[PDB]
């Protein structure tokens, strides 16, 4: 059986590599990067990533904050992030229900107070909360 | 080597979940449906399939069906399906020479009598019996 | 287990079946050959295949030149090798310090005798020794 997870894991190899070369995905760490390139609301991509087995990006590093960023600056838009501050205010979390750890806020954000419950990134890595009905670049991982 | 099993299933999943955002495959069940948007005859959809270690696609289910539909719709373009009724009339196998269940004949097909031997699908996923010469849209399942 | 281990390697199939399908991949043997389609020079070549996971690729048989060639054919343009004769002159190595074994030079090269280090391939598949700054089609191996 040697023989066939030495073959399997070479092979995982070889199809992530040219994933990885053709632009069409980021690994960082355990997870994994990917845009289409196609620009929706935030309903949206969670969507569209939820339908390809994945979830709405988000960075909770700095290695993962620099890996979306560069997407963002790749197809130079701004992109939505997996986090949401509905139910109170000023407390953003994850869609997973945690309290939000890592940040990289725009100087003077978050400033919504009440109507900006998304976070949109823009192409320089830095955050800034937002409503969540604008058309931006759909970011998933997996 | 449990660790091991875990970190392949999740990377198979990563790389799954990149080619379905990218548009590159559908999955059903057991089968991976693709197409590169290339249109040739049926003869030649068959060599392209086999060569990518594949089969030209055949929907033996509703869902399967909805499956290739949607590919259909999308790339909006007939499509030549994996089933024949060469060695005898009216008598239609998949290409592992088993008999067709599932059907989803367009109202008055199937109606060649003769001449017809390979199955198209038009864009709303029914299907008519055709010649297997015409350009159509190569779909292969994995 | 063996559940696991059948569908681990039918949806490995099924990925590089899409993969090969798309055109974004060819398979020969061991080794899994890919082009994005960029030029660019030999050093930079080798750090976009290392940033992939894999390395410049180069053929060691007859049946790896004939893939890369059909690669160069395709997207119609000069592909550098991952083969060099920098520490001793007319003396080419693969990148792992091996002596090369299998060539297929054009009638007449190598003929640089000090000043041409690198190694390119026509699109016929023959090879010229040259210089390391041209502009050549990437293509890398996994
Ligand atoms: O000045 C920046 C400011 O501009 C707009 O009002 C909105 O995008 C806010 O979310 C943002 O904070
Ligand atoms: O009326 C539809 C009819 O049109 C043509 O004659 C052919 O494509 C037939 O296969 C098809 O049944
Ligand atoms: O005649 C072919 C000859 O042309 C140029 O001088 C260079 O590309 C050489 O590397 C090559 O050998
Ligand atoms: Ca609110
Ligand atoms: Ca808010
Ligand atoms: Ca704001
Ligand atoms: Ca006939
Ligand atoms: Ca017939
Ligand atoms: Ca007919
Ligand atoms: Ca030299
Ligand atoms: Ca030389
Ligand atoms: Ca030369
Ligand atoms: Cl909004
Ligand atoms: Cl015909
Ligand atoms: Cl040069």
Not at 51 to 75: C, D, L
Not at 82 to 104: C, K, P, R
Request: aromatic share 10%.
């Amino acid at each position: 059986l040697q023989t066939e997870l030495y073959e399997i894991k070479h092979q995982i190899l070889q199809t992530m590599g040219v994933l990885s070369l053709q632009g069409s995905m980021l690994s960082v760490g355990d997870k994994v990067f990917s845009t289409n390139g196609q620009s929706v609301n935030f309903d949206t991509i969670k969507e569209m990533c939820t339908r390809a087995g994945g979830n709405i990006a988000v960075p909770r590093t700095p290695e993962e904050n620099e890996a979306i960023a560069s997407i963002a600056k790749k197809y130079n838009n701004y992109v939505y992030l997996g986090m949401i501050d509905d139910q109170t205010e000023g407390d953003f979390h994850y869609l997973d229900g945690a309290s939000v750890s890592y940040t990289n806020w725009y100087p003077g954000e978050p400033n919504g107070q009440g109507k900006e419950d998304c976070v949109e990134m823009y192409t320089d890595g830095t955050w800034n909360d937002r409503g969540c009905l604008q058309y931006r670049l759909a970011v998933c991982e997996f």
